[PDB]
Structure formats: structure tokens, C-alpha cells
């Protein structure tokens with residue numbers, strides 16, 4: 001045989017195994033491919049990889065600035081480096097070198113006659129919410145990660161527990177915490193507004209046993225079934241009303257006024273209320289069945305997350321539940337997608353990922369006890385944790 | 391589910407063992423391509439968001455001395471033990487180790503203790519650690535500056551070392567080479583980085599006797615002039631592989647680098663000669679004038695000047711051997727194109743295909759006689775040039 005024939009055969013077999021399974025099996029296969037790559041690389045390969053994989057975010061940012069990915073995604077035929085350069089207003093040599101690099105990391109695809117077509121990654125980077133995620137990685141995460149090593153060295157490697165005293169303050173030369181500082185930056189606010197439009201899949205309703213959790217709960221008089229606290233575009237409310245259209249009870253999306261305004265266009269005309277509410281203030285809706293917090297508490301250290309829960313707890317009755325939908329990394333063998341997040345949010349927000357036991361300790365500080373845990377993603381675990389009053 | 395994954399790992403491991411280092415490199419590139427093709431859109435953005443953590447966390451571990459310590463440890467270590475020994479917060483240490491284990495920077499045991507992986511050992515080696523630190527402190531800033539630099543300037547073709555992303559990244563008018571002389575810690579890290587020797591090298595495929603022909607070392611001619619030879623690894627390996635070939639073997643570099651090289655050079659057989667390769671070549675009529683990973687760091691203008699400084703010293707039998715990257719016309723790999731982007735951003739230079747090398751050398755009056763590749767699939771080659 002030959003190295004090329006062996007490589008093609010590996011690809012053929014891995015592709016057959018991947019299609020055959022579901023999305024969780026494909027995620028497990030991808031994690032295995034990454035681990036194999038790390039185990040088989042040479043020392044020089046390790047250093048080269050660490051040196052050069054960072055180029056991907058910068059070059060994706062350049063392609064986004066140029067509008068290259070959306071343009072290539074709508075192109076019917078392969079495009080030369082000339083055509084793309086002239087159309088997008090880029091230097092021809094610069095464009096050619098960028099495209100060669102992008103093709104080498106599958107950001108685009110290069111044809112046999114050295115022309116260019118969209119890849120899966122091209123299409124992904126053309127989607128506004130995902131492009132906004134990439135831009136957030138470049139303009140928000142990279143600086144904090146840049147500042148983290150010298151920040152830890154200066155401070156003799158402390159345990160970071162405060163949002164106002166972490167790498168972010170050094171990275172952006174400010175006293176403010178990340179959220180307060182971002183509120184003053186219009187372009188970053190706009191990018192976050194676009195990033196909110198991305199909807200994760202799957203969601204908690206794929207495994208959440210709603211009827212069982214409800215039991216004999218009654219919606220009268222005018223009680224709320226579901227209060228989506230910091231619900232963003234209200235994707236959770238939309239999916240809930242879609243899956244259980246005949247279930248009685250108010251479905252309430254709570255967020256800040258600008259986000260609710262952004263959400264108005266894609267919300268259904270009836271069945272979901274938009275209610276301006278700051279979750280650092282007491283919860284107005286009394287005795288709701290579910291108070292839902294998805295990807296909220298992960299962004300706050302224990303003190304602030306506890307304060308958010310303490311703003312909710314006095315509104316609960318015996319049947320009320322607080323549903324924390326968030327990451328629940330394992331005690332051991334956590335994956336890169338749950339630990340890298342931990343490092344990023346430590347550096348930018350002073351917060352952390354929490355194991356199930358850590359979630360239970362935090363919630364017990366608020367007077368809550370865990371009743372059930374409903375995983376809905378694998379192998380990186382996201383779960384809806386249902387808490388009741390102690 | 392688990393079983394299938396374990397079987398894939400077993401099979402890929404066996405296939406990697408079945409082949410040589412070039413086959414393993416091809417397999418690794420295939421695994422990367424498969425990962426990119428099979429990831430979800432969300433996975434793509436997540437990977438791009440989080441893989442940046444690896445360099446920062448490796449830098450932290452290097453600052454702590456974690457990798458060398460773990461590399462010398464006889465038994466698995468708890469996060470508590472590592473934190474107390476290295477002077478790190480216990481919570482911070484535990485979170486760092488969890489992250490590192492997730493990317494194989496260390497290995498986590500079933501009882502949540504930690505041992506060295508191949509990557510731990512790699513990051514403990516001074517030259518490779520220095521490469522990682524160079525990526526963090528030198529490359530990252532320039533790459534972070536590149537998008538806004540290009541946007542500000544309406545996306546120009548970068549051709550000048552004094553007008554690229556580096557100037558914006560480090561708020562200076564100087565080119566990278568002038569600016570480095572004013573930075574002590576970066577100079578020290580580069581000094582350590584010079585001690586790393588790439589493998590394999592050109593002598594694995596270079597037909598020395600064939601290229602030599604009937605060339606005579608008599609009466610006192612030079613066989614090999616290593617221009618910008620650094621530690622002189624090429625000279626050392628040449629004398630090791632061809633101990634009986636006569637002729638002077640000369641390491642040329644700047645005085646601080648030659649002083650650094652003196653300790654590990656052999657006691658005899660290799661001359662250390664101070665020479666700035668921006669000035670005429672002093673050694674006349676040598677058989678091989680060797681430039682390894684030199685010209686890639688310069689735009690066409692300066693690289694041409696470097697070659698023109700050598701050409702007048704050549705006789706009919708002299709050859710200029712450019713040992714450098716020769717990426718293909720199409721299908722270039724990430725390790726050659728990422729380098730192209732980095733050196734564009736920092737130095738204003740570029741990677742060159744074989745045709746581009748031949749055009750550059752023809753401007754100096756040189757013609758390509760032979761090309762001897764010695765790495766795959768990323769192409770490094772010794773290109774042998776003679777007078778036109």
C-alpha cells in the first residue's frame with residue numbers, strides 16, 4: 001500500500017462509523033480523534049500546534065471583516081483568489097495567502113485547479129450567531145487569556161473568586177467587572193445581541209419529564225407555569241410552548257429591556273409574555289411552577305449566584321421549583337469543552353464551572369435541595385437540575 | 391459506544407506503530423481533517439474559542455515549573471501535593487490540572503491524581519518550552535494585532551519588515567530584529583530556543599558524495615560554511631555523518647551566538663567565525679554555502695541581498711544550499727501556511743514555493759541544480775544552487 005491509501009482508508013472507515021451513530025456518538029468520536037492526535041504527535045508537532053492553531057481565530061476574524069465567508073457561501077461556482085480579492089477589496093497576494101491558510105484548516109475548500117469553495121466551516125462562519133461567537137472569542141476571550149499568566153504570576157497564583165479582581169481588569173485596564181464594562185462598549189454589545197440569536201441543540205425538553213414534574217399542579221388563578229429568567233430570545237419559552245401547546249399556565253420571558261426588544265420579532269404573537277426584570281432584584285412572579293435559569297449562574301462567582309437565587313427563593317411556594325439548566329462537569333475525566341470554559345470564565349468573570357456536588361452546595365446555601373437531574377447532552381454534560389425548598 | 395471508541399484508538403495506534411514518522415504525520419493530519427469535517431457548527435466555534443487556552447495554560451505551567459516537576463515525579467501526584475510543592479493556590483491548581491488533563495498536557499488517573507504525558511515531558515524540555523513561550527509572548531501579540539492592522543490599511547500586500555502587524559502590536563517603528571535587541575527576556579528565551587535541534591535533518595537524504603564530485607579540499611579549502619548556523623547543529627551533524635571528508639567546516643554567526651555555541655561544539659574540526667551575513671562572504675571558493683531557515687525570515691529584497699553577498703565568493707564548483715520550507719503549489723498543510731501567516735505578520739516575509747525560490751535565486755544569478763526533500767508531508771528541502 002501507501003501512506004495516502006492508508007489515510008484515505010482511515011477517513012472512509014471513520015466517516016462510515018460517524019454517520020452511523022447519533023450526535024453524541026459523533027462527539028465521542030471527535031474527542032477520541034483529538035486525543036489520538038495529541039498522543040501521536042511529536043514534541044516538535046506539539047509546539048508547532050500550540051504556536052499555529054491560534055492563527056485560526058485571527059484569520060477567521062479577518063475573513064469576517066472582509067465578508068468572505070458569507071460571500072463564498074452564496075457563490076454558485078468555485079472562485080479564484082483574484083475574484084475574491086477584487087470583489088471583497090483585498091490585496092491579491094494577501095487574499096491568496098489567507099485562502100491557502102484557510103483551506104489548510106478547512107475554513108474553505110481548495111479545488112484541484114486552485115480555486116475556492118465553501119466548506120462546512122465556511123457556512124458556519126457565515127451564520128450571524130456563530131460568526132458573533134467567533135468574534136467574541138477574538139475580541140473578549142483572547143485578551144483575558146493573554147493577561148492571565150502574568151496576572152497569576154504578579155499575584156502569586158491566588159484562587160480567583162471576585163469578578164472585580166481577575167485577569168479582565170488587567171486585560172482591559174479598568175476597575176469595572178466584565179459585564180459593567182461591556183455595557184459601555186457599543187460594538188461589543190451589538191455583537192452579543194447577535195450572539196444571542198444562536199439556539200443550542202439539543203435542549204432540556206428532550207429529556208425533561210414535564211408531566212411528571214408537574215403532577216397535579218394547577219394553573220389557576222393566573223399562575224405561571226414557566227418563568228425564563230435571563231431567557232434572552234426566549235428560545236426555551238418558544239420550545240416549551242411548541243412541545244406542550246395545550247399545557248395551561250403563563251409562560252414568561254424575563255430579561256433586560258433591550259434584549260426583550262430584540263426578542264420581540266421572533267416571539268410568537270401570543271402565549272409568551274415579555275417581562276422586563278433584572279435578576280439582581282426580587283422576583284415579581286409569585287408561586288410559579290418553574291423558575292428557569294439556563295446558562296446564567298455559571299457566569300457569576302458563588303456570592304453573586306447565591307444572591308440571584310436568594311432573589312428568587314422568597315417568591316416560591318411548596319410546589320415551585322428552580323430549574324438550573326447548566327453545565328455539570330464530572331468529578332473526573334472532564335472534557336476540553338467543559339474545562340476550557342472554566343478557565344475562560346475564571347479569567348473574564350471570576351466564576352467557575354460546577355460539578356453536581358458544587359451546584360448542590362451552592363443551592364443549599366439558598367435553602368434549596370436537589371430533587372432531580374435530567375441530562376440532555378453527552379459527553380459534555382448539560383442538565384436541568386430541579387431544586388425545591390428545603 | 392465506549393467500545394467503538396476504544397477500538398478506533400487501538401486501530402489508529404497500531405497503524406501508527408506500523409508506519410514511520412512520515413506516515414504518522416500523515417495520519418495525524420488526517421485525524422485533524424476528520425475532526426474538522428465531523429464537528430458541528432457549534433463545535434467549530436467552541437473549538438476556536440477554547441483551543442486558545444492551551445498556550446496560556448502551558449505558559450502558566452511553565453512559570454510554575456509544573457511540567458519539569460511532574461516529569462521527574464515517580465508516582466501520581468494529587469492536586470493538593472502539586473499546589474503545595476509549586477506554590478500555587480489549591481483551587482487554581484486543581485482547575486488548571488483538570489484543564490490540562492482534558493487536553494493531554496498532563497494525564498489524570500482514575501483516583502484523580504496526575505502523571506506526566508508525552509506533552510508534559512515535551513514542555514519540560516528547555517528548547518521546546520522556549521518555543522511555546524515564544525508563541526505566547528511574540529506570536530500572539532502580532533496575530534492579535536493583524537486583523538485591525540489590515541482593516542485600518544484597507545488590506546495591503548505586506549512586503550516590508552518595518553510596516554506590518556508587528557509595529558502595531560508592540561507600538562514601535564522598529565522592525566522585529568531591531569526591536570528584539572532592546573528586550574532582555576525575549577533575547578534570553580530566543581537563546582534557549584536556538585538550542586532545540588529539529589529532526590530529521592537534510593543529511594538523511596542529501597547525497598553528499600554525489601554533490602561533491604571530484605571537488606578537492608586541497609590545499610586548504612572549505613567544505614561547508616554554515617551561514618547563520620546558530621549553535622552549529624548542521625556542522626556537528628555533518629562532521630558526525632562524514633568524519634573522513636576533508637575540508638574546513640565553518641560556523642558563521644554573530645558573536646553572542648558563537649559564544650553561546652562554544653560550549654557544545656566539538657573540541658576540534660569546526661571553526662567559529664564571526665560574520666554578519668549582510669556583508670560580503672569572507673570564505674572564498676567553498677563547496678557548500680549553507681543557509682538553513684534564514685531566508686524565510688526576510689522579504690524578497692533583503693533575502694536577495696543576503697544571496698548577493700555570497701555569490702561573488704563562489705567558484706564554478708561552489709554551491710549555495712538553501713535548506714528551508716518549500717510548500718507545494720496547492721494542498722499546502724497547516725504547518726506551512728500558519729508559518730506563512732505568522733512570518734508575514736511579524737517579519738513581513740513569506741513562505742516560498744519552489745518556483746518562487748527559483749525566481750529569487752535567479753535574481754542573484756543562481757540556477758537550481760537539485761532539490762533533496764527530507765521531511766513529509768510538510769516539505770523541508772535542501773535546494774542546491776550553482777552559478778548561472
Ligand SMILES: C[S@@+](CC[C@H](N)C(=O)[O-])C[C@H]1O[C@@H](n2cnc3c(N)ncnc32)[C@H](O)[C@@H]1O
Pocket residue numbers: 196229230231232233234235236254255256259277278279280293294295296
Ligand atoms: C447566557 S445569555 C442567555 C441565556 C438564555 N437563558 C438561554 O439559554 O437561551 C445571558 C442572558 O442573561 C441576560 N441578563 C444579563 N444580565 C441580566 C440581568 N441583570 N437581569 C436579567 N437578565 C440579564 C442577558 O440579556 C442574556 O440574555
Ligand SMILES: C[S@@+](CC[C@H](N)C(=O)[O-])C[C@H]1O[C@@H](n2cnc3c(N)ncnc32)[C@H](O)[C@@H]1O
Pocket residue numbers: 584617618619620621622623624642643644647665666667668681682683684
Ligand atoms: C533560524 S535561527 C538559526 C537556524 C540555523 N541556521 C539552524 O537551522 O540550525 C537564525 C540564525 O541567524 C542568525 N543571524 C541573525 N542575523 C544575523 C546576521 N545579521 N548575520 C549572521 N547571522 C545572523 C541568528 O543568530 C540565528 O542563529
